[PDB]
Amino acid sequence: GKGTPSFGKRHNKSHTLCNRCGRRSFHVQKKTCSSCGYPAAKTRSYNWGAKAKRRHTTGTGRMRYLKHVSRRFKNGFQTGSASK
Amino acid sequence: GRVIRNQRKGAGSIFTSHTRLRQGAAKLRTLDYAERHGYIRGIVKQIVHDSGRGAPLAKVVFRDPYKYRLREEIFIANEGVHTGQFIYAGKKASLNVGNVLPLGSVPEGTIVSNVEEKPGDRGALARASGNYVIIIGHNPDENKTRVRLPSGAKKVISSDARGVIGVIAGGGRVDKPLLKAGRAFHKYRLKRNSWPKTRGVAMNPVDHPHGGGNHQHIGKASTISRGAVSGQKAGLIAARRTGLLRGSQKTQ
Amino acid sequence: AQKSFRIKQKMAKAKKQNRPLPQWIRLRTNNTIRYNAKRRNWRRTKMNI
Amino acid sequence: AQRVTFRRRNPYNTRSNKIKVVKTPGGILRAQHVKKLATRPKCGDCGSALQGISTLRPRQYATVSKTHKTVSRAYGGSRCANCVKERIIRAFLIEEQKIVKKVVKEQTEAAK
RNA sequence: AAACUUUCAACAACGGAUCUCUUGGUUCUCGCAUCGAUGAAGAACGCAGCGAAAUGCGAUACGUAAUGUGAAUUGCAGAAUUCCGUGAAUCAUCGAAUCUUUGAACGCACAUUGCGCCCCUUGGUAUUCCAGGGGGCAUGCCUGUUUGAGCGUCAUUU
RNA sequence: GCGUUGGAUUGUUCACCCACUAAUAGGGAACGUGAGCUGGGUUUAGACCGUCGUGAGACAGGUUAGUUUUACCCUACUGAU
RNA sequence: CUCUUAAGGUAGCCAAAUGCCUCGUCAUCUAAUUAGUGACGCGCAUGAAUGGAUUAACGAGAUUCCCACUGUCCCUAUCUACUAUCUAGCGAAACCACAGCCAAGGGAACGGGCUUGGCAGAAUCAGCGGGGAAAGAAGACCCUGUUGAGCUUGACUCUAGU
RNA sequence: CGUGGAGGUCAGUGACGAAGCCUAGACCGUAAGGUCGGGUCGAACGGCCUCUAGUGCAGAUCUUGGUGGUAGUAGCAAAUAUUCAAAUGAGAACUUUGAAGACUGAAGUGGGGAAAGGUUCCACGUCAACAGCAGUUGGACGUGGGUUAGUCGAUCCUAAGAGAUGGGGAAGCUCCGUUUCAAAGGCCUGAUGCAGGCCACCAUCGAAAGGGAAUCCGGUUAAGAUUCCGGAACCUGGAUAUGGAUUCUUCACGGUAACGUAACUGAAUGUGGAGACGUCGGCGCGAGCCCUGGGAGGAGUUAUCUUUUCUUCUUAACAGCUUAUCACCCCGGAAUUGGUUUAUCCGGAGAUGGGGUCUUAUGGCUGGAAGAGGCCAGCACCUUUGCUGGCUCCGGUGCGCUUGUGACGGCCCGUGAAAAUCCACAGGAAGGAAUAGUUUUCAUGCCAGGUCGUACUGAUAACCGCAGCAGGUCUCCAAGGUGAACAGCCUCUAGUUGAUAGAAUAAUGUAGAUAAGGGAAGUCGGCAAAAUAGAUCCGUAACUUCGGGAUAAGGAUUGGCUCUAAGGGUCGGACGAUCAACUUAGAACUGGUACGGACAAGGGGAAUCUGACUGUCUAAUUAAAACAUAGCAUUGCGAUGGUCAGAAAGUGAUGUUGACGCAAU
RNA sequence: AUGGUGAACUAUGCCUGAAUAGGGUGAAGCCAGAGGAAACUCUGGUGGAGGCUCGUAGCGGUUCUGACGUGCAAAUCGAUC
RNA sequence: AUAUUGGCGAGAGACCGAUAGCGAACAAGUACAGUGAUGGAAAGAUGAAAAGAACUUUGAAAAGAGAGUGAAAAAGUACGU
Ligand SMILES: CN[C@@H]1[C@@H](O)[C@@H](O[C@@H]2[C@@H](O)[C@H](O[C@H]3O[C@H]([C@@H](C)O)[C@@H](O)[C@H](O)[C@H]3N)[C@@H](N)C[C@H]2N)OC[C@]1(C)O
Ligand SMILES: CN[C@@H]1[C@@H](O)[C@@H](O[C@@H]2[C@@H](O)[C@H](O[C@H]3O[C@H]([C@@H](C)O)[C@@H](O)[C@H](O)[C@H]3N)[C@@H](N)C[C@H]2N)OC[C@]1(C)O
Ligand SMILES: CN[C@@H]1[C@@H](O)[C@@H](O[C@@H]2[C@@H](O)[C@H](O[C@H]3O[C@H]([C@@H](C)O)[C@@H](O)[C@H](O)[C@H]3N)[C@@H](N)C[C@H]2N)OC[C@]1(C)O
Ligand SMILES: [Mg+2]
Ligand SMILES: [Mg+2]
Ligand SMILES: [Mg+2]
Ligand SMILES: [Mg+2]
Ligand SMILES: [Mg+2]
Ligand SMILES: [Mg+2]
Ligand SMILES: [Mg+2]
Ligand SMILES: [Mg+2]
Ligand SMILES: [Mg+2]
Ligand SMILES: [Mg+2]
Ligand SMILES: [Mg+2]
Ligand SMILES: [Mg+2]
Ligand SMILES: [Mg+2]
Ligand SMILES: [Mg+2]
Ligand SMILES: [Mg+2]
Ligand SMILES: [Mg+2]
Ligand SMILES: [Mg+2]
Ligand SMILES: [Mg+2]
Ligand SMILES: [Mg+2]
Ligand SMILES: [Mg+2]
Ligand SMILES: [Mg+2]
Ligand SMILES: [Mg+2]
Ligand SMILES: [Mg+2]
Ligand SMILES: [Mg+2]
Ligand SMILES: [Mg+2]
Ligand SMILES: [Mg+2]
Ligand SMILES: [Mg+2]
Ligand SMILES: [Mg+2]
Ligand SMILES: [Mg+2]
Ligand SMILES: [Mg+2]
Ligand SMILES: [Mg+2]
Ligand SMILES: [Mg+2]
Ligand SMILES: [Mg+2]
Ligand SMILES: [Mg+2]
Ligand SMILES: [Mg+2]
Ligand SMILES: [Mg+2]
Ligand SMILES: [Mg+2]
Ligand SMILES: [Mg+2]
Ligand SMILES: [Mg+2]
Ligand SMILES: [Mg+2]
Ligand SMILES: [Mg+2]
Ligand SMILES: [Mg+2]
Ligand SMILES: [Mg+2]
Ligand SMILES: [Mg+2]
Ligand SMILES: [Mg+2]
Ligand SMILES: [Mg+2]
Ligand SMILES: [Mg+2]
Ligand SMILES: [Mg+2]
Ligand SMILES: [Mg+2]
Ligand SMILES: [Mg+2]
Ligand SMILES: [Mg+2]
Ligand SMILES: [Mg+2]
Ligand SMILES: [Mg+2]
Ligand SMILES: [Mg+2]
Ligand SMILES: [Mg+2]
Ligand SMILES: [Mg+2]
Ligand SMILES: [Mg+2]
Ligand SMILES: [Mg+2]
Ligand SMILES: [Mg+2]
Ligand SMILES: [Mg+2]
Ligand SMILES: [Mg+2]
Ligand SMILES: [Mg+2]
Ligand SMILES: [Mg+2]
Ligand SMILES: [Mg+2]
Ligand SMILES: [Mg+2]
Ligand SMILES: [Mg+2]
Ligand SMILES: [Mg+2]
Ligand SMILES: [Mg+2]
Ligand SMILES: [Mg+2]
Ligand SMILES: [Mg+2]
Numbered sequence A: 001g002k003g004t005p006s007f008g009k010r011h012n013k014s015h016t017l018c019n020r021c022g023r024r025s026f027h028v029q030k031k032t033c034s035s036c037g038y039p040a041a042k043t044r045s046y047n048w049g050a051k052a053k054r055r056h057t058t059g060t061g062r063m064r065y066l067k068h069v070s071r072r073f074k075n076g077f078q079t080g081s082a083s084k
Numbered sequence B: 001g002r003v004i005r006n007q008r009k010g011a012g013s014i015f016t017s018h019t020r021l022r023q024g025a026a027k028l029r030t031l032d033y034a035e036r037h038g039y040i041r042g043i044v045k046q047i048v049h050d051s052g053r054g055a056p057l058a059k060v061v062f063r064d065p066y067k068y069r070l071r072e073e074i075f076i077a078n079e080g081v082h083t084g085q086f087i088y089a090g091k092k093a094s095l096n097v098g099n100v101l102p103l104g105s106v107p108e109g110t111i112v113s114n115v116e117e118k119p120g121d122r123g124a125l126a127r128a129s130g131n132y133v134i135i136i137g138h139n140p141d142e143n144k145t146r147v148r149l150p151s152g153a154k155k156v157i158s159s160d161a162r163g164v165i166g167v168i169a170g171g172g173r174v175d176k177p178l179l180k181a182g183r184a185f186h187k188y189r190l191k192r193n194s195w196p197k198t199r200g201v202a203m204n205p206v207d208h209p210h211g212g213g214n215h216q217h218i219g220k221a222s223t224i225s226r227g228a229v230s231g232q233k234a235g236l237i238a239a240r241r242t243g244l245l246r247g248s249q250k251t252q
Numbered sequence C: 001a002q003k004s005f006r007i008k009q010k011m012a013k014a015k016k017q018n019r020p021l022p023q024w025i026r027l028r029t030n031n032t033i034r035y036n037a038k039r040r041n042w043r044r045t046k047m048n049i
Numbered sequence D: 001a002q003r004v005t006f007r008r009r010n011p012y013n014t015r016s017n018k019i020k021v022v023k024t025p026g027g028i029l030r031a032q033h034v035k036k037l038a039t040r041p042k043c044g045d046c047g048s049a050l051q052g053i054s055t056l057r058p059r060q061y062a063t064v065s066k067t068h069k070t071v072s073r074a075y076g077g078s079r080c081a082n083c084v085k086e087r088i089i090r091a092f093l094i095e096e097q098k099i100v101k102k103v104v105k106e107q108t109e110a111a112k
Numbered sequence E: 001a002a003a004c005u006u007u008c009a010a011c012a013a014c015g016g017a018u019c020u021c022u023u024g025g026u027u028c029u030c031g032c033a034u035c036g037a038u039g040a041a042g043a044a045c046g047c048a049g050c051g052a053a054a055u056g057c058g059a060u061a062c063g064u065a066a067u068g069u070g071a072a073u074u075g076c077a078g079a080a081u082u083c084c085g086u087g088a089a090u091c092a093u094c095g096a097a098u099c100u101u102u103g104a105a106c107g108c109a110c111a112u113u114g115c116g117c118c119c120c121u122u123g124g125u126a127u128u129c130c131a132g133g134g135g136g137c138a139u140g141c142c143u144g145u146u147u148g149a150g151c152g153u154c155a156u157u158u
Numbered sequence F: 001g002c003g004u005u006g007g008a009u010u011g012u013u014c015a016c017c018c019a020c021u022a023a024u025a026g027g028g029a030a031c032g033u034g035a036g037c038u039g040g041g042u043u044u045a046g047a048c049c050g051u052c053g054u055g056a057g058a059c060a061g062g063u064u065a066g067u068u069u070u071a072c073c074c075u076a077c078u079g080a081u
Numbered sequence G: 001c002u003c004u005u006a007a008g009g010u011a012g013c014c015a016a017a018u019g020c021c022u023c024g025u026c027a028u029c030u031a032a033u034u035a036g037u038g039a040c041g042c043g044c045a046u047g048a049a050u051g052g053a054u055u056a057a058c059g060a061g062a063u064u065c066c067c068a069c070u071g072u073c074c075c076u077a078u079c080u081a082c083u084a085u086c087u088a089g090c091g092a093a094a095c096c097a098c099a100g101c102c103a104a105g106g107g108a109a110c111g112g113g114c115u116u117g118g119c120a121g122a123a124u125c126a127g128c129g130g131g132g133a134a135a136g137a138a139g140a141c142c143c144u145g146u147u148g149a150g151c152u153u154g155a156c157u158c159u160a161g162u
Numbered sequence H: 001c002g003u004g005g006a007g008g009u010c011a012g013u014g015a016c017g018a019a020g021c022c023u024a025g026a027c028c029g030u031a032a033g034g035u036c037g038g039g040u041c042g043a044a045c046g047g048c049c050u051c052u053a054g055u056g057c058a059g060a061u062c063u064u065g066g067u068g069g070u071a072g073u074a075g076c077a078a079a080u081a082u083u084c085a086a087a088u089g090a091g092a093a094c095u096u097u098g099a100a101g102a103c104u105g106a107a108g109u110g111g112g113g114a115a116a117g118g119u120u121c122c123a124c125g126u127c128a129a130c131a132g133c134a135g136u137u138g139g140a141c142g143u144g145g146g147u148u149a150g151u152c153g154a155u156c157c158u159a160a161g162a163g164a165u166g167g168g169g170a171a172g173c174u175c176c177g178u179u180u181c182a183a184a185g186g187c188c189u190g191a192u193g194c195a196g197g198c199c200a201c202c203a204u205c206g207a208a209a210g211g212g213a214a215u216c217c218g219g220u221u222a223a224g225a226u227u228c229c230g231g232a233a234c235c236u237g238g239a240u241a242u243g244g245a246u247u248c249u250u251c252a253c254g255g256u257a258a259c260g261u262a263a264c265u266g267a268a269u270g271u272g273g274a275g276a277c278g279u280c281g282g283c284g285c286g287a288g289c290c291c292u293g294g295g296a297g298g299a300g301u302u303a304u305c306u307u308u309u310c311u312u313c314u315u316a317a318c319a320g321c322u323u324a325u326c327a328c329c330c331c332g333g334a335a336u337u338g339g340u341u342u343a344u345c346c347g348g349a350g351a352u353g354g355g356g357u358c359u360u361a362u363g364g365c366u367g368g369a370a371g372a373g374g375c376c377a378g379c380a381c382c383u384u385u386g387c388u389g390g391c392u393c394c395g396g397u398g399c400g401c402u403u404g405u406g407a408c409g410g411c412c413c414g415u416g417a418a419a420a421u422c423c424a425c426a427g428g429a430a431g432g433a434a435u436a437g438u439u440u441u442c443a444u445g446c447c448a449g450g451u452c453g454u455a456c457u458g459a460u461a462a463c464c465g466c467a468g469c470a471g472g473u474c475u476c477c478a479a480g481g482u483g484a485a486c487a488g489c490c491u492c493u494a495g496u497u498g499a500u501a502g503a504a505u506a507a508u509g510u511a512g513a514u515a516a517g518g519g520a521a522g523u524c525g526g527c528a529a530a531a532u533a534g535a536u537c538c539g540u541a542a543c544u545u546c547g548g549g550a551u552a553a554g555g556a557u558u559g560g561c562u563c564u565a566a567g568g569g570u571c572g573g574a575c576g577a578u579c580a581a582c583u584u585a586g587a588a589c590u591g592g593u594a595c596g597g598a599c600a601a602g603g604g605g606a607a608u609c610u611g612a613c614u615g616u617c618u619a620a621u622u623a624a625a626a627c628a629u630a631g632c633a634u635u636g637c638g639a640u641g642g643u644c645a646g647a648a649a650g651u652g653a654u655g656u657u658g659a660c661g662c663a664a665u
Numbered sequence I: 001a002u003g004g005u006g007a008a009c010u011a012u013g014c015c016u017g018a019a020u021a022g023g024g025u026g027a028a029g030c031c032a033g034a035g036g037a038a039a040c041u042c043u044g045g046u047g048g049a050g051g052c053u054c055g056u057a058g059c060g061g062u063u064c065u066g067a068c069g070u071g072c073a074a075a076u077c078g079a080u081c
Numbered sequence J: 001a002u003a004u005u006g007g008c009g010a011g012a013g014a015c016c017g018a019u020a021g022c023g024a025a026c027a028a029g030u031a032c033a034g035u036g037a038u039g040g041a042a043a044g045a046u047g048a049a050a051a052g053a054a055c056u057u058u059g060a061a062a063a064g065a066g067a068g069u070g071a072a073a074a075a076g077u078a079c080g081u
């Protein structure tokens, strides 16, 4: 049964949870993950993959630091505080 | 076409050697002050069976010359070496089965194994079970020695290069009929996966050049150039002759 | 059985979210939620570890 | 007619998982995990298991008293007795025969 | 003749067509020049009186400071809440902070919340073993400092 | 009008014998009849031989192994209210 | 004897899973045998590790006979459960131009429909396998296309290596 | 002619109703179309002259959506099976409890886990959806509750393998190399850099089945327990003191010895031993289970019978004494060879024998520990369920079963991992008493042991198969009979009794059966079906590689009951006493001639083709005559090499290798 | 064509584990004995070999060209093997 | 001076009008499939205002019938037409 009776044997995860992007793309035996290429320095991307790209580029996250950098630029990068 | 068996062997995935149960690389002692001037004893403590060698091994302990401790060497046990035999190694050693000496230190007709190709390689030629060389002549000026390898071809090698006196034990091994297919299995089980072999004539032309036919047949010369290309060489490679060998061999 | 923490932690965030809408959400003004869309169940959608 | 269960996380019959049937105070049978038997230490000379020495597993040899790690003779827990007996005689006779070899070769140099 | 079947109608079904909407999409133009080791993009996991999400934030967690406005917030509950006031508020604004686990991710690892090392401090009778607490050890390269190595090499000791 | 068979070899139709018989006539119905059968032949994918071909492969040359789907609709027919 | 070759099929085996002719001939087994077996051999096209011959034992391998046994058959019969069938509840699918009684005619040379005749009367259940040239998949055979791929070779044109 | 949008106009229509929809109502045109009334409706929209295009649908096996006929139809038939009463509820074939019939039958429908799931676990609440009938039930819905460890795992170690680093390739993403053409780093002492001696292994990841430091019983929860509660332990790392021992012969005596012990300095530097290992055979022995006698309690049957049937009768880790095959040592010197295993091997290289030493597997007694646990009886009266008492004891039997283990034997061109650890030995640095000094391996005593996991399922509903799919998916435990037997069949314990149901009993079927006479005439062909069968005895061909062929072929027997005979153990010195087995042979009687009585269980013979055999392959049409193989033969290669890999390389496979070898036919 | 992602299945090697009722046969090794002038030859045991064998479970997939063929199921079910 | 399918900030269109317009006008790179790279939806409109139908009645309930709100229940959270 190249079918069902021999799907009854799938118990062993090909990947586990990638640390960097969280995707369950982390290949066990290969000790790298198939989405961002962790542990490679750069994060994996290609141009045929614009849907993947659009999925992961800046703006799908919290933008924790970067958000306010347009505000900060607006002001001339101020130090100190306002008085009264 | 696909990639034939004999090309696929060479990046060595499932083909590399079955290395686990193996006693460790058999070698002579390094070529040092003790062997190239004086001689140095050792004791064979243990002779023991190597997996994927037909030839028993001798575990021989020496004394470190330059610090206080024992050093163990793995020696290919020539026929007759026994547990607790003293073994003597170096230019000035004596001639007895199991001692090792440079080659210019033995008469011609001396029957020696594990000989170095160049002095210091800790042994090269005639390491097979029952396999030896004979010293057939010396040229003391540019010191050499002439020796016939178990192939029979004849070579000129430095007299410095050591050998071990006698022939390797466990000979007559290939004298026994393997007798059934499994016995072949385990022999190669510990050796490597070359076995079994499937005739290239029983596959299709993408598995092999011998592939194809509405009968199984080679259909072109099975002697094939030295100059062939990888994936062209199967069958008889660069054979000078072919066909059943009549009469007597044995070069001179 | 004996599980990684990373797993036994995501297990917890899982259980924690398996709940009907808080019914008070419905009363809020300009509130467009009705039911809990993302609700899961063990036997239906497996989590993928 | 009682049956029994593994008391640990290994269902498999491996070497570490050996199991013994034990009838308790409760009147019920129960499983018990055995450790793998200890094998007597051996003589570093002839390979004999050496008598008098207590037989345990290795770190059990750091919990116990020095007098069951050896007997009294020199080379106590190393070698098998009759094998110490040997390396004595050989030691004596070869230092003796070493003296005999010295004076025969001082008579070979002068008497030549 | 009913039943049944067809056809038209009205009401009722079924379904979401039409029509009208439109905080969205699209394109055109105009102006601007700002991510990151001073830990960026991204990730996981958390935070609320009562939330599963979106959005927001980080053990100070739908937020802290500061500045402006000048009385709300609201689904209910709630405020020594405090209204001619350094003052409501999920407001705007932002110049000061926090900023878990991570991540180019940096002590070593990482299918583990797995294993070191060094300095300060505390507690167990403690330079040393245990614990708590704060503070630290990645790599390539430049400038410079200190300590070094080589009959590479120059002088100078008697 | 009415009956035109039973067997031996053969996948065979055909051919041919044996036997009984009154007689063992010839044909048609999509060379009647595969959601009636069977699958032995033919006619894929495995394999052997012989001839052919350098070869892959070929052979109207001989062999062996090789999944036979669905009716509940209409009509038709059979019986039934 | 002659022509000819690198050499001209030896030892063996055969109508063999290799023989066109072919159901070869003879023998044998049968009432009868394109089958089996034994022989014979100008063998279309047998044949020596392209392996030849032979062979104990083995085999879910192809074939032949015999004894036993049998519903394989003459030739059908009878029983058991579960179905089908009727009931309550539950409730799909394929398929569907429109549809559905024949004959003959003509017709794209086999019509449910057209033409001329036979004819024809509600609403229906269980069966059935004649028809719907039924359904199933833009024919796998065949051809054509200046459409392909797998594979082969002294095809064109190249190329790693050497 | 019509549609979306734009420029202009009609100061165009409109909440007193725009647009849209509905209408076998009315009108204009040949028509595309246009107008109207009535209905529904709510917020915008139209004429005209021009502008512009994503501008008109019946189809494209068209796209998305929506809906019919088929049709209350095909169907809801594997897994032996259900019944009676009551409780509850609006409602009971289906939920609960009680009674009955049964099943899975310890190779489980039982008791636990590994992977995977991830809250399913458990309680309460609950029935819209789901559980292809039902539903008061659920693995559903809703709200909660729940998983406790120095000792069980993880952590540590290494395996195949993976992989940083001085480096070498590559335009580069990166390839290569883990000892790697490297100035690689520590550790113990003291006299905090210093004096020193060293040792120099150059990362790391890679096992919840390998290795490994250490916990047991009793009790407890709705749900967790080797974790919690009670008692009883052990280990590891830190701290130190008291006793003991040791010394004026400083680092203990005894014993011929093997060895002894409550102890009884030890730096490196070295060395040795456990870590550490195949597989099968028979023999021994332990543990659990099985069977079973006496008795002390409870239960059942009792018209009749049975000193009867069932059942309780238990002992943990840990500590002390003691306990062993093997191997030893001392005495003694062997032919007339003795000793000895089921299995032929041992002895002048020292046997048979007398006497000793050891491992402490494993057993025995005690401690633990009866105070626990188990079985009974008597109270006391709703207040709880407390309280009192009792018995818990002595044996036997073995080719039994399982599992452990020993001493051996067969087996190999197969000889069957590594590391981290722990110990010992050699060794002799250095430090040590007498007015008192050394002693953490003898005893006792103190402090500390983190962190992650721990529920449950583990499958005909908790995993994967689109699902509560007749499929697939790793493992431990295993009672009685019959029997060769974990077979098949019946049973104890536990666990089920789930699968839509009711009524019939046509055709045809699926699944199971039997047939008079004939006996393959059926047919491509015995397809299919029948016949055969176990055990004891007798009988047994051609051929053969002498192993086979062979259960060849082919016969006879078999029940029950009642007798006979043979086969053993232990004692104290041709005997006697006593204990305890089922095997085999034999013989009488007996029956509706039946007896492997259910179950279980070969059809055989002669040949031809063909592959030698065991094995392998097309998952999901081909198990074959194909492949493989042992055997045979041929080729290449002596390393500066053959075969092969790679973009390159200080690159790589064979190579832990060297012609009895590797590579190619 | 280019650039990516798969050895949870399956193929094959390595590392580490685990598993396999009851019977038939009776190879070497060995013990006793018997015949024979000798060389040598028999007999009865004992022992327990074999990619031996009947046959479970395991792994497999022969036939019914059996069930099913909008299935239990995109490979399953029974019997036989 | 030139470039600008990205980022921040702005004005617009003979553009699209929820099967259109970016795939997403909605908790949209969501849910969900997949070992994985990847793939990848459906889904806007009660009304001015909840005034979201008190209360009676049949029903075990869900609901039904009255009543009530509202300009409109020919708007009852299955909601415009
Ligand atoms: C096999 N199908 C046929 C079908 O073809 C069809 O057609 C036949 C047709 O073949 C005959 O037609 C025939 O008859 C004529 C003659 C009678 O004039 C002949 O000459 C002519 O060759 C022939 N075609 C016709 N006479 C009867 C039809 N029903 O109908 C009758 C049938 C038997 O079913
Ligand atoms: C100047 N040329 C030479 C240069 O050719 C090269 O030679 C190497 C030599 O260093 C290697 O030698 C070194 O490296 C090898 C390495 C292969 O493991 C080691 O085994 C070896 O012991 C070590 N000495 C040698 N085995 C290969 C030569 N071609 O490197 C050494 C050098 C002297 O610089
Ligand atoms: C020319 N043949 C192709 C071919 O695909 C064929 O059928 C195939 C079949 O051959 C393949 O598989 C085939 O071979 C396998 C083999 C592993 O044994 C068999 O399991 C299978 O039965 C067989 N049909 C099947 N997996 C797909 C079909 N479309 O026939 C249809 C076709 C597309 O035209
Ligand atoms: Mg698997
Ligand atoms: Mg994998
Ligand atoms: Mg995903
Ligand atoms: Mg993409
Ligand atoms: Mg400024
Ligand atoms: Mg290729
Ligand atoms: Mg290797
Ligand atoms: Mg192989
Ligand atoms: Mg071969
Ligand atoms: Mg071969
Ligand atoms: Mg082939
Ligand atoms: Mg080729
Ligand atoms: Mg070629
Ligand atoms: Mg070929
Ligand atoms: Mg072929
Ligand atoms: Mg051939
Ligand atoms: Mg051949
Ligand atoms: Mg040819
Ligand atoms: Mg709104
Ligand atoms: Mg509103
Ligand atoms: Mg899924
Ligand atoms: Mg999945
Ligand atoms: Mg997972
Ligand atoms: Mg076992
Ligand atoms: Mg009428
Ligand atoms: Mg809007
Ligand atoms: Mg940060
Ligand atoms: Mg919020
Ligand atoms: Mg303020
Ligand atoms: Mg704000
Ligand atoms: Mg402002
Ligand atoms: Mg903080
Ligand atoms: Mg943790
Ligand atoms: Mg971790
Ligand atoms: Mg301190
Ligand atoms: Mg510390
Ligand atoms: Mg015709
Ligand atoms: Mg026909
Ligand atoms: Mg027909
Ligand atoms: Mg058919
Ligand atoms: Mg056919
Ligand atoms: Mg056929
Ligand atoms: Mg194919
Ligand atoms: Mg077949
Ligand atoms: Mg019907
Ligand atoms: Mg013939
Ligand atoms: Mg022949
Ligand atoms: Mg013939
Ligand atoms: Mg014939
Ligand atoms: Mg016949
Ligand atoms: Mg012929
Ligand atoms: Mg002819
Ligand atoms: Mg010929
Ligand atoms: Mg020839
Ligand atoms: Mg020849
Ligand atoms: Mg030929
Ligand atoms: Mg032959
Ligand atoms: Mg076979
Ligand atoms: Mg067969
Ligand atoms: Mg034949
Ligand atoms: Mg029917
Ligand atoms: Mg019905
Ligand atoms: Mg139809
Ligand atoms: Mg007519
Ligand atoms: Mg006609
Ligand atoms: Mg007609
Ligand atoms: Mg028609
Ligand atoms: Mg007409
Ligand atoms: Mg028909
Ligand atoms: Mg049809």
Ligand SMILES: [Mg+2]
Residues within 6 Å of the ligand: none
């Ligand atoms: Mg086509």
Ligand SMILES: [Mg+2]
Residues within 6 Å of the ligand: G139
């Ligand atoms: Mg076509």
Ligand SMILES: [Mg+2]
Residues within 6 Å of the ligand: G146
């Ligand atoms: Mg043309």
Ligand SMILES: [Mg+2]
Residues within 6 Å of the ligand: G148
């Ligand atoms: Mg082409």
Ligand SMILES: [Mg+2]
Residues within 6 Å of the ligand: G149, G150
């Ligand atoms: Mg192709």
Ligand SMILES: [Mg+2]
Residues within 6 Å of the ligand: H004, H054
């Ligand atoms: Mg438009």
Ligand SMILES: [Mg+2]
Residues within 6 Å of the ligand: none
């Ligand atoms: Mg109107």
Ligand SMILES: [Mg+2]
Residues within 6 Å of the ligand: H043
């Ligand atoms: Mg309006």
Ligand SMILES: [Mg+2]
Residues within 6 Å of the ligand: none
């Ligand atoms: Mg258009």
Ligand SMILES: [Mg+2]
Residues within 6 Å of the ligand: none
């Ligand atoms: Mg349209």
